[PDB]
């Protein structure tokens, strides 16, 4: 039954660098204007399409390095932090000793169109969501110590090299002045360098279906969210849950031969299965922050997960009619 | 006879505390050099110390790097490896016309180091300075760092695509390259250096990313390289009172080994069980390079390390005879 999945992927691919050229013009302009300011002088780039079905909705991130940062964990949430400082161009945005996300974002929007993580620009069909992020080159927070468990797949050496890279903090409510950990750069680097073999997907002998499986999962969730957009059951699910579950599946299946392209049908099915399991048991560990449960009852209620479970099982039993 | 090979490797493994002493000197030198405007951005390539000889644990090798932004290279004759350094300036005090003088820069480098050393002893281009700590030796090399694109002479080198992948080769070529002062057969030229890339490929050396991180994936690449280098070191020692082997170096061994890695890209061609054959096939390849007088620089394909203009055929024939004898008699020089 994988032929239908292949048809779906063909249609998704036929739907580019033009629109991105327009977006690039606008983003370079905005970054120059921001760089003229004392507080955002170090602003910089770390295009991405959050929804695979929306080729004209872009997502970019403006970073800003914060040297010698001091993090205060909010409420043992493992993912949300106050940003204190350990000579400070962000002093304009302090509320006591904490960097205020409110003031910083207010000024950021000022320099920058439409309304945490911060601005939606139009450039008649193209939309661009811009998120502000602090960059830190300090070691990763202690809540990540047991995350990114790629040692049996991409290797312990790669894990060390990745953990030597910066981490990011985006403004997000937990209490209004908290910042949330972001590792989207690591997710991207893994997705584009995803095999146990370094030449994975560089030759016919070593073609795998990891990326295709992820795209099919994201498209399944997007189609289901669209179809039931009039109900509220699926409003809290996002491609972040899909990507986290996909990375967990990659950890469970670390060999390239478990992702042979010929087995797309099974591989995708496996992905679906794991996601469904996560829904039923209400457990989806953040891939980088293992004590953060994205499927906690404090975040998504039981009924929403049961509804998504039923809809997905229906789709799989009927060869995914929502793909059409 | 692979058991003897593994015995040799065991003995080579069995103090490197010594580095401590090395570090103590190195840091201090770097402190002093950083007070000068010309050497303001000096640092360690980074690992403070390396060893060019597997059998000289007290003989260390250090590279001090210094970034030259907006560098302009001009290739000497068509050497493909040697260049004059010009600029597109804290180094303007060493400028002879429009070209950076290796002689003046080196003179100042060693002057500063000598004055700092006096507060260790100094021995009199590339290993700019040799310091003897206590009774421990440290060869220090000055290198310019350029973060611009690699020179055009390297465009078809580093052919690791079928071994370490094309993505890895692109990432490696995005790293800086280095220029070490070195005279050419002309005394104000600089020679390309990629020893950082060499270290990276040796310590991340398999097609599989988990090569040598578990029992199922142990390969014998590093052991074959160690055995080749020990073979050369022992042969150069045994015949050091003749000049026949003075021009051969661990660089030749390493270059030939990397070529063999390109020829045998699969981890299953380096299974630890097959150490004996793998090493043999390394020796053979090196031998081939000696007979045909051809050993392309792994990063600069048109620079022939075994050219008749660099090493004459008498030396290559002597080394071939010695190596073939050793291989036919189960390597008694290892003892
Ligand atoms: C990925 C992502 N898909 N996505 C999405 N998928 C859709 C599918 C159909 C229709 C609409 C859709 N919208 C979305 O809205 C995000 C955002 C995001 C995208 C861009 C900018 C900001 N946010 C995000 C979220 C919802 N959660 N999240 C996150 N939760 C965390 C918890 C702990 C630690 C880190 C965390 N990161 C995150 O990054
Ligand atoms: C000679 C040498 N050419 N070379 C080189 N030639 C090039 C030609 C074109 C492009 C790049 C090139 N790089 C190089 O990088 C060295 C180094 C070295 C190191 C530090 C400073 C200067 N050169 C070295 C090594 C790698 N081994 N080695 C050595 N092996 C020994 C074994 C036994 C006994 C003594 C030994 N000495 C040694 O001298
Ligand atoms: Zn692949
Ligand atoms: Zn190995």
XYZ file of C-alpha atoms and ligand atoms in Angstrom:
739
model
C 0.000 0.000 0.000
C 3.065 2.244 -0.001
C 2.316 3.375 -3.576
C -0.277 5.824 -2.225
C 2.263 7.241 0.238
C 4.669 7.688 -2.679
C 1.969 9.532 -4.643
C 1.417 11.825 -1.648
C 5.138 12.562 -1.419
C 5.283 13.287 -5.160
C 2.500 15.870 -4.874
C 4.105 17.422 -1.783
C 7.433 17.748 -3.675
C 5.989 19.312 -6.886
C 4.932 22.191 -4.562
C 9.853 28.040 -4.176
C 13.432 29.408 -4.177
C 11.692 32.429 -5.770
C 9.510 33.177 -2.771
C 12.539 32.537 -0.561
C 14.444 35.165 -2.525
C 11.754 37.712 -1.696
C 11.807 36.627 1.964
C 15.615 36.887 1.988
C 15.517 40.470 0.744
C 13.111 41.460 3.507
C 15.019 39.629 6.261
C 18.390 41.121 5.327
C 16.804 44.574 5.433
C 15.247 43.996 8.862
C 18.493 42.605 10.269
C 20.430 45.674 9.131
C 17.918 47.992 10.805
C 18.071 45.938 14.017
C 21.883 45.893 13.924
C 21.853 49.690 14.040
C 20.420 49.441 17.589
C 22.670 49.100 20.633
C 20.631 46.251 22.126
C 20.185 44.194 18.929
C 23.592 44.865 17.357
C 24.534 41.187 17.490
C 21.275 40.131 15.859
C 21.677 37.450 13.233
C 20.294 34.360 11.601
C 20.909 30.930 13.083
C 13.813 29.835 5.898
C 11.789 26.911 7.237
C 8.275 25.647 6.573
C 6.581 24.605 9.807
C 3.680 23.112 7.836
C 4.739 20.991 4.868
C 1.437 21.829 3.115
C 1.868 25.641 3.277
C 4.738 26.467 0.894
C 4.171 30.231 1.269
C 4.216 30.444 5.090
C 7.805 30.885 6.279
C 9.401 30.646 9.722
C 12.715 32.340 10.541
C 14.547 33.019 13.797
C 16.537 36.129 14.720
C 19.194 35.183 17.273
C 21.094 37.389 19.708
C 24.092 36.201 21.702
C 23.935 36.616 25.478
C 27.427 36.072 26.930
C 27.858 34.796 30.499
C 24.162 34.046 30.955
C 22.711 32.878 34.284
C 19.597 30.712 34.074
C 17.013 30.332 36.844
C 14.743 27.326 36.407
C 11.086 28.301 36.763
C 9.065 25.971 38.994
C 11.140 22.865 38.138
C 9.479 22.884 34.699
C 12.788 21.684 33.146
C 12.105 23.785 30.038
C 11.213 27.324 31.211
C 13.761 29.723 32.690
C 14.347 33.254 33.900
C 17.324 34.949 32.246
C 19.625 36.687 34.698
C 23.135 37.998 33.896
C 26.548 37.122 35.393
C 28.760 45.897 30.108
C 25.225 44.658 29.372
C 23.613 45.982 26.161
C 20.282 44.421 27.246
C 20.196 46.475 30.457
C 17.413 48.543 28.891
C 15.096 45.520 29.240
C 15.727 44.527 32.868
C 12.959 44.261 35.455
C 15.103 43.943 38.536
C 17.762 41.379 37.603
C 15.660 39.420 35.068
C 15.623 40.160 31.351
C 12.007 41.068 30.622
C 10.701 39.265 27.546
C 7.901 41.852 27.475
C 10.124 44.932 27.099
C 12.614 43.246 24.766
C 9.830 42.018 22.480
C 8.091 45.416 22.586
C 11.254 47.111 21.316
C 11.930 44.300 18.814
C 8.455 44.753 17.315
C 8.933 48.550 17.318
C 11.988 48.357 14.986
C 10.294 45.764 12.739
C 2.883 43.353 9.361
C 0.756 41.846 12.201
C 0.860 40.731 15.848
C 5.242 35.578 22.496
C 7.212 33.463 20.028
C 6.512 37.627 17.728
C 5.808 39.168 14.331
C 3.956 38.076 11.187
C 4.951 40.005 8.058
C 3.276 39.675 4.607
C 5.334 39.975 1.362
C 0.065 39.280 -1.162
C 0.675 35.524 -0.662
C 3.884 35.118 1.404
C 3.780 35.148 5.204
C 6.839 35.258 7.468
C 6.709 34.588 11.200
C 9.728 35.997 13.052
C 10.721 34.673 16.491
C 13.372 36.285 18.704
C 15.889 34.025 20.443
C 18.817 34.379 22.833
C 21.935 32.395 21.920
C 24.137 30.944 24.654
C 27.489 29.228 24.152
C 27.574 28.012 27.756
C 26.997 24.340 28.491
C 23.462 23.037 28.110
C 21.175 23.157 31.173
C 21.168 20.210 33.566
C 17.672 19.226 32.395
C 19.241 18.047 29.109
C 21.832 15.733 30.680
C 19.933 12.562 29.721
C 18.422 13.864 26.468
C 19.517 13.551 22.839
C 20.065 9.804 23.239
C 21.606 9.267 19.810
C 24.676 7.254 20.933
C 23.445 3.924 19.432
C 22.340 5.667 16.191
C 24.457 8.709 15.328
C 27.184 7.883 17.963
C 28.434 9.226 21.303
C 31.085 11.239 19.452
C 28.383 13.036 17.459
C 26.401 13.584 20.667
C 29.392 15.271 22.299
C 30.069 17.450 19.245
C 26.396 18.480 19.131
C 26.343 19.299 22.841
C 29.357 21.568 22.316
C 27.095 23.810 20.155
C 25.061 26.809 21.390
C 21.523 26.481 22.723
C 18.687 28.968 22.347
C 15.995 30.589 24.488
C 12.736 31.919 23.036
C 10.286 34.145 24.971
C 7.296 32.075 26.044
C 4.726 32.175 28.829
C 4.802 29.423 31.428
C 4.372 33.856 34.593
C 5.142 36.269 31.748
C 8.938 36.787 31.825
C 10.093 33.211 31.182
C 12.193 31.909 28.292
C 11.923 28.377 26.888
C 14.742 26.163 25.644
C 15.042 25.689 21.889
C 17.148 23.095 20.059
C 15.576 23.453 16.597
C 19.047 23.801 15.080
C 20.048 20.387 16.439
C 16.823 18.856 15.116
C 17.611 20.262 11.674
C 21.229 19.074 11.715
C 20.126 15.563 12.658
C 17.380 15.420 10.024
C 19.809 16.371 7.233
C 22.587 14.064 8.570
C 20.388 11.247 9.775
C 21.993 7.867 9.071
C 24.329 5.591 10.959
C 26.309 5.477 7.715
C 27.844 8.803 6.735
C 26.924 8.136 3.082
C 23.269 7.438 3.911
C 21.151 8.634 0.970
C 24.216 9.593 -1.103
C 23.969 6.504 -3.345
C 21.392 4.031 -4.634
C 22.655 1.286 -2.316
C 21.931 3.409 0.785
C 18.582 5.119 0.183
C 16.498 5.332 3.367
C 13.003 6.673 4.057
C 13.503 8.589 7.324
C 12.718 12.013 5.833
C 9.751 10.651 3.866
C 8.303 9.075 7.013
C 8.597 12.383 8.862
C 6.957 14.303 6.010
C 4.074 11.820 5.865
C 3.540 12.092 9.626
C 3.508 15.903 9.507
C 1.135 15.884 6.522
C -1.200 13.445 8.288
C -1.415 15.732 11.315
C -1.887 18.829 9.143
C -4.710 17.262 7.115
C -6.444 16.028 10.271
C -6.130 19.465 11.889
C -7.634 21.111 8.802
C -10.532 18.656 8.504
C -11.528 19.143 12.163
C -10.632 22.845 12.383
C -14.254 23.564 13.354
C -13.839 21.433 16.477
C -11.285 22.220 19.180
C -9.986 18.692 19.818
C -6.858 18.926 17.639
C -5.940 22.568 18.308
C -3.103 21.731 20.722
C -1.258 19.196 18.538
C 1.624 20.410 16.393
C 4.473 19.235 14.191
C 6.696 19.426 17.277
C 4.947 16.374 18.732
C 5.324 14.603 15.378
C 9.039 15.409 15.170
C 9.686 14.387 18.788
C 7.955 11.034 18.265
C 9.856 10.557 14.996
C 13.197 11.117 16.733
C 12.192 8.609 19.413
C 11.448 6.091 16.647
C 14.865 6.811 15.123
C 16.416 6.042 18.507
C 14.478 2.766 18.711
C 15.496 1.806 15.138
C 19.121 2.961 14.858
C 20.251 0.891 11.849
C 19.923 2.191 8.299
C 18.586 -1.183 7.125
C 15.553 -0.645 9.380
C 14.740 2.372 7.174
C 15.187 0.855 3.697
C 13.218 2.828 1.124
C 11.506 -0.337 -0.151
C 9.882 -0.638 3.308
C 8.333 2.855 3.419
C 4.918 1.305 4.081
C 6.087 -0.526 7.187
C 8.344 2.298 8.359
C 5.591 4.911 8.163
C 3.213 2.468 9.849
C 5.759 2.022 12.639
C 5.942 5.798 13.061
C 2.149 6.027 13.265
C 2.069 3.194 15.791
C 4.563 4.820 18.133
C 2.756 8.154 17.971
C -0.524 6.397 18.746
C 1.091 4.602 21.677
C 2.276 7.973 22.982
C -1.297 9.247 22.746
C -2.832 6.293 24.572
C -0.351 6.232 27.461
C -0.195 10.070 27.578
C 3.611 10.068 27.411
C 5.836 11.871 24.895
C 9.188 12.874 26.374
C 10.818 15.955 24.908
C 13.731 14.512 22.942
C 16.192 16.951 24.559
C 14.474 17.406 27.952
C 13.389 13.870 28.914
C 11.559 14.908 32.093
C 9.313 17.236 30.056
C 6.191 15.338 28.955
C 4.647 16.994 25.901
C 1.569 14.760 26.280
C 1.006 15.453 29.980
C -2.599 15.834 31.096
C -1.538 19.301 32.297
C -0.998 20.269 28.630
C -3.488 18.203 26.582
C -6.598 16.615 28.040
C -7.482 12.938 27.704
C -10.409 13.516 25.330
C -8.320 15.388 22.749
C -5.772 12.564 22.627
C -8.526 9.941 22.388
C -10.086 11.864 19.491
C -6.778 12.088 17.631
C -6.149 8.401 18.372
C -9.495 7.382 16.870
C -9.109 9.596 13.798
C -5.603 8.268 13.068
C -6.656 4.637 13.546
C -9.572 5.242 11.179
C -7.189 6.691 8.595
C -4.771 3.769 8.825
C -7.530 1.155 8.623
C -8.854 2.808 5.426
C -5.500 3.500 3.702
C -5.406 7.180 4.726
C -8.294 8.838 2.829
C -7.334 12.208 4.331
C -4.215 12.220 2.140
C -6.387 12.602 -0.984
C 52.150 -13.579 12.505
C 49.450 -11.044 13.345
C 50.078 -11.882 17.005
C 53.474 -10.187 16.724
C 51.781 -7.107 15.245
C 49.433 -6.968 18.242
C 52.406 -7.443 20.590
C 54.085 -4.451 18.951
C 50.914 -2.396 19.396
C 50.655 -3.431 23.056
C 54.235 -2.323 23.733
C 53.609 0.943 21.854
C 50.631 1.638 24.117
C 52.416 1.012 27.457
C 53.607 9.131 31.310
C 51.882 11.274 28.685
C 52.255 14.053 33.119
C 54.893 15.107 30.584
C 52.279 17.148 28.711
C 51.756 19.077 31.956
C 55.268 20.450 31.756
C 54.732 21.162 28.041
C 51.503 23.017 28.779
C 53.227 25.106 31.430
C 55.713 26.428 28.896
C 53.195 26.742 26.064
C 50.670 28.901 27.965
C 53.419 31.211 29.146
C 54.773 31.665 25.632
C 51.251 32.352 24.380
C 50.772 34.931 27.130
C 53.955 36.777 26.170
C 53.283 36.617 22.429
C 49.781 37.978 23.002
C 51.266 41.196 24.393
C 52.688 41.966 20.933
C 50.569 43.681 18.288
C 51.899 41.460 15.490
C 50.984 38.249 17.365
C 47.916 39.565 19.210
C 45.609 36.753 18.097
C 48.044 33.865 18.490
C 46.689 30.605 19.846
C 46.677 26.846 19.681
C 45.046 25.195 16.672
C 43.107 22.981 19.128
C 44.838 19.644 22.169
C 48.109 21.467 22.961
C 50.420 18.652 21.970
C 50.929 16.048 19.259
C 53.630 13.458 18.552
C 55.194 13.070 15.114
C 56.973 9.881 16.276
C 55.028 7.075 17.965
C 58.202 5.917 19.721
C 59.296 9.302 21.168
C 56.676 10.038 23.850
C 58.858 12.862 25.224
C 59.068 14.626 21.827
C 56.062 16.924 21.420
C 54.821 19.007 18.492
C 52.842 22.237 18.884
C 51.352 24.645 16.329
C 50.744 28.299 17.192
C 48.155 29.706 14.783
C 47.510 33.345 13.890
C 44.586 34.493 11.765
C 45.326 36.601 8.697
C 42.018 38.116 7.511
C 41.621 39.161 3.884
C 44.715 37.238 2.800
C 45.852 37.245 -0.842
C 47.889 34.255 -1.988
C 50.068 34.071 -5.077
C 51.369 30.642 -6.033
C 55.148 30.281 -6.399
C 56.016 29.004 -9.863
C 53.447 26.211 -10.228
C 54.334 24.420 -6.986
C 50.605 24.185 -6.060
C 51.745 23.911 -2.420
C 53.978 26.980 -1.894
C 52.683 30.557 -1.915
C 53.620 34.159 -1.280
C 51.385 35.883 1.270
C 50.095 39.347 0.324
C 47.266 41.359 1.856
C 43.959 42.757 0.649
C 47.587 45.586 9.255
C 49.462 44.389 12.355
C 51.806 42.340 10.133
C 52.889 45.409 8.132
C 56.155 45.511 10.115
C 57.215 42.237 8.430
C 56.247 43.378 4.913
C 59.005 43.257 2.260
C 57.296 45.293 -0.447
C 53.873 43.695 -0.918
C 54.818 40.233 0.382
C 54.884 39.000 3.975
C 58.449 38.074 4.947
C 58.681 34.649 6.562
C 62.193 35.588 7.708
C 61.223 38.754 9.605
C 58.071 37.262 11.145
C 60.018 34.188 12.252
C 62.872 36.308 13.619
C 60.466 38.235 15.836
C 58.610 35.038 16.818
C 61.794 33.343 18.049
C 63.114 36.542 19.657
C 59.995 36.850 21.820
C 60.067 33.136 22.637
C 63.767 33.246 23.556
C 63.301 36.182 25.918
C 60.357 34.420 27.572
C 62.213 31.078 27.793
C 65.028 32.771 29.732
C 62.707 33.433 32.698
C 64.241 25.396 29.475
C 66.735 25.812 26.637
C 66.477 26.698 22.956
C 68.004 24.870 19.993
C 68.707 26.479 16.623
C 61.625 27.468 9.112
C 58.620 25.176 9.723
C 59.568 23.833 13.205
C 60.448 27.499 13.828
C 61.751 26.771 17.331
C 62.812 23.720 19.322
C 62.677 23.927 23.116
C 64.233 21.326 25.433
C 62.377 21.258 28.804
C 64.481 19.902 31.711
C 66.674 17.142 30.186
C 61.210 16.675 27.125
C 61.409 18.387 23.682
C 58.822 20.710 22.052
C 58.849 21.696 18.376
C 56.783 24.864 17.896
C 55.448 25.782 14.454
C 54.083 29.178 13.440
C 51.098 29.058 11.089
C 48.842 31.640 9.480
C 45.123 30.844 9.622
C 42.860 31.739 6.708
C 39.089 31.295 6.848
C 38.747 32.056 3.131
C 38.098 29.375 0.520
C 40.730 26.679 0.112
C 43.167 27.385 -2.750
C 42.315 26.102 -6.216
C 45.143 23.540 -6.070
C 43.080 21.572 -3.513
C 39.893 21.391 -5.596
C 40.281 17.691 -6.486
C 42.011 16.601 -3.270
C 40.472 15.113 -0.130
C 38.534 12.544 -2.169
C 36.700 11.077 0.819
C 33.260 11.130 -0.831
C 32.865 7.357 -1.090
C 34.429 6.843 2.365
C 33.460 9.638 4.796
C 30.723 11.091 2.470
C 30.398 14.232 0.342
C 28.575 16.108 3.114
C 31.603 15.559 5.353
C 33.987 16.743 2.631
C 31.941 19.916 2.166
C 31.943 20.545 5.922
C 35.703 19.964 6.127
C 36.366 22.356 3.248
C 34.392 25.039 5.125
C 37.046 24.922 7.855
C 40.092 27.223 7.714
C 43.402 26.254 6.133
C 46.892 27.022 7.381
C 50.138 28.361 5.933
C 53.492 27.444 7.474
C 56.722 29.296 6.545
C 58.831 26.955 4.422
C 61.516 27.399 1.789
C 61.109 25.989 -1.712
C 63.710 24.803 -4.201
C 63.235 30.800 -2.608
C 63.115 31.698 1.076
C 59.967 33.822 1.572
C 57.274 31.268 0.711
C 54.572 29.634 2.829
C 53.322 26.058 2.404
C 49.765 24.779 2.797
C 48.967 22.819 5.958
C 45.893 20.657 6.593
C 47.108 18.657 9.603
C 43.910 19.575 11.471
C 41.882 17.860 8.744
C 44.210 14.853 9.000
C 43.618 14.576 12.747
C 39.842 14.879 12.267
C 39.699 12.104 9.614
C 41.899 9.786 11.761
C 39.800 10.225 14.912
C 36.480 10.066 12.961
C 37.555 7.462 10.469
C 34.768 5.026 9.566
C 31.942 4.964 7.075
C 29.737 4.186 10.073
C 29.485 6.962 12.647
C 29.722 4.338 15.421
C 32.915 2.810 14.033
C 35.019 1.559 16.968
C 32.389 2.513 19.578
C 31.201 -1.082 20.089
C 32.478 -4.630 19.705
C 30.620 -5.317 16.450
C 32.286 -2.317 14.762
C 35.957 -2.444 15.781
C 38.244 -1.710 12.822
C 42.020 -1.706 12.527
C 42.649 1.577 10.686
C 44.506 3.400 13.474
C 46.565 0.300 14.289
C 47.670 -0.053 10.659
C 48.744 3.592 10.649
C 50.643 3.151 13.924
C 52.417 0.074 12.564
C 53.427 1.843 9.346
C 54.788 4.819 11.303
C 56.682 2.533 13.702
C 58.161 0.650 10.739
C 59.455 3.886 9.230
C 60.751 5.224 12.560
C 62.655 2.007 13.304
C 64.144 1.808 9.809
C 65.267 5.446 9.962
C 66.815 4.769 13.375
C 68.679 1.625 12.287
C 70.213 3.436 9.277
C 70.566 6.924 10.776
C 74.352 6.951 10.255
C 73.711 6.780 6.511
C 71.729 9.476 4.710
C 69.564 7.112 2.647
C 66.420 7.479 4.786
C 66.757 11.081 6.004
C 64.104 12.463 3.624
C 61.279 10.038 4.486
C 58.793 11.179 7.118
C 55.609 10.137 8.879
C 53.887 12.527 6.460
C 54.629 10.107 3.616
C 53.298 7.217 5.712
C 50.149 9.175 6.592
C 49.528 10.254 2.986
C 49.857 6.688 1.695
C 47.585 5.452 4.493
C 44.874 7.980 3.611
C 45.090 6.866 -0.017
C 44.582 3.271 1.143
C 41.546 4.426 3.145
C 40.138 5.903 -0.060
C 40.821 2.638 -1.919
C 39.085 0.552 0.791
C 36.136 2.717 1.882
C 34.073 0.047 3.680
C 34.523 -0.605 7.393
C 34.301 -4.329 6.590
C 37.605 -4.010 4.706
C 39.279 -3.010 8.004
C 37.879 -5.657 10.377
C 40.127 -6.007 13.427
C 40.298 -9.763 12.770
C 42.105 -8.969 9.495
C 44.794 -6.693 10.993
C 47.494 -8.924 9.531
C 46.248 -8.631 5.969
C 45.243 -4.977 6.277
C 48.715 -3.962 7.453
C 50.230 -6.052 4.662
C 48.117 -4.246 2.080
C 49.256 -0.926 3.529
C 52.912 -1.950 3.231
C 52.388 -3.129 -0.347
C 50.745 0.151 -1.323
C 53.554 2.170 0.229
C 55.997 -0.068 -1.634
C 54.138 0.608 -4.884
C 54.447 4.350 -4.274
C 58.193 3.948 -3.774
C 58.713 1.946 -6.964
C 56.632 4.175 -9.243
C 58.027 7.309 -7.510
C 54.485 8.622 -7.073
C 52.767 9.687 -3.846
C 50.226 12.455 -4.408
C 49.651 14.839 -1.533
C 46.257 13.810 -0.200
C 44.991 17.411 -0.317
C 46.996 18.745 -3.300
C 46.866 16.005 -5.970
C 49.434 17.532 -8.348
C 52.128 17.797 -5.648
C 54.032 14.505 -5.899
C 55.721 13.848 -2.553
C 57.893 11.117 -4.126
C 59.055 13.273 -7.044
C 62.581 12.712 -8.334
C 63.184 16.418 -7.634
C 62.521 15.870 -3.899
C 63.832 12.342 -3.259
C 66.231 10.584 -5.586
C 65.661 7.004 -6.738
C 68.601 5.580 -4.751
C 66.844 6.442 -1.473
C 63.529 4.953 -2.626
C 65.271 1.747 -3.733
C 67.096 1.484 -0.403
C 63.849 1.912 1.533
C 62.103 -0.586 -0.751
C 64.805 -3.199 -0.164
C 64.662 -2.672 3.607
C 60.854 -2.825 3.798
C 60.656 -5.902 1.557
C 63.250 -7.700 3.684
C 61.288 -6.817 6.829
C 58.010 -8.032 5.332
C 59.602 -11.284 4.152
C 61.045 -11.987 7.624
C 58.054 -11.026 9.836
C 59.375 -7.549 10.680
C 62.363 -8.168 13.005
C 63.014 -4.399 13.086
C 59.961 -4.102 15.351
C 61.890 -5.816 18.167
C 7.254 23.030 15.700
C 5.905 23.636 15.517
N 5.041 23.130 14.645
N 3.900 23.908 14.699
C 2.775 23.640 13.904
N 2.509 22.422 13.291
C 1.300 22.593 12.624
C 0.569 21.705 11.843
C -0.612 22.154 11.299
C -1.067 23.455 11.521
C -0.358 24.347 12.294
C 0.831 23.895 12.839
N 1.761 24.519 13.644
C 4.063 24.893 15.629
O 3.126 25.783 15.905
C 5.329 24.763 16.151
C 5.832 25.682 17.242
C 6.648 26.902 16.832
C 7.057 27.132 15.533
C 7.778 28.276 15.243
C 8.058 29.162 16.252
C 7.606 28.872 17.515
N 6.908 27.766 17.815
C 6.251 25.014 18.535
C 5.212 24.532 19.360
C 3.741 24.551 19.127
N 5.726 24.007 20.459
N 7.099 24.126 20.384
C 7.867 23.672 21.469
N 7.257 23.161 22.605
C 8.315 22.876 23.463
C 8.295 22.331 24.744
C 9.498 22.158 25.385
C 10.703 22.507 24.775
C 10.744 23.038 23.504
C 9.532 23.223 22.858
N 9.230 23.733 21.605
C 7.445 24.763 19.213
O 8.699 25.024 18.885
C 58.735 16.625 6.833
C 57.358 17.137 6.591
N 56.966 17.471 5.368
N 55.661 17.904 5.463
C 54.942 18.341 4.342
N 55.393 18.310 3.054
C 54.415 18.836 2.234
C 54.376 19.022 0.864
C 53.233 19.586 0.345
C 52.163 19.954 1.162
C 52.201 19.767 2.524
C 53.349 19.199 3.065
N 53.669 18.897 4.384
C 55.248 17.843 6.761
O 54.034 18.200 7.141
C 56.298 17.366 7.506
C 56.200 17.147 9.000
C 56.553 18.374 9.833
C 56.214 18.472 11.168
C 56.536 19.618 11.869
C 57.171 20.641 11.213
C 57.459 20.478 9.880
N 57.153 19.373 9.181
C 56.742 15.827 9.501
C 55.857 14.736 9.658
C 54.391 14.672 9.408
N 56.525 13.678 10.092
N 57.844 14.050 10.240
C 58.785 13.106 10.683
N 58.450 11.786 10.660
C 59.532 11.088 11.156
C 59.726 9.729 11.340
C 60.936 9.338 11.868
C 61.919 10.269 12.202
C 61.727 11.619 12.019
C 60.511 12.038 11.487
N 60.055 13.325 11.199
C 57.999 15.363 9.874
O 59.168 15.977 9.907
Zn 19.020 8.324 4.637
Zn 37.188 2.212 13.365
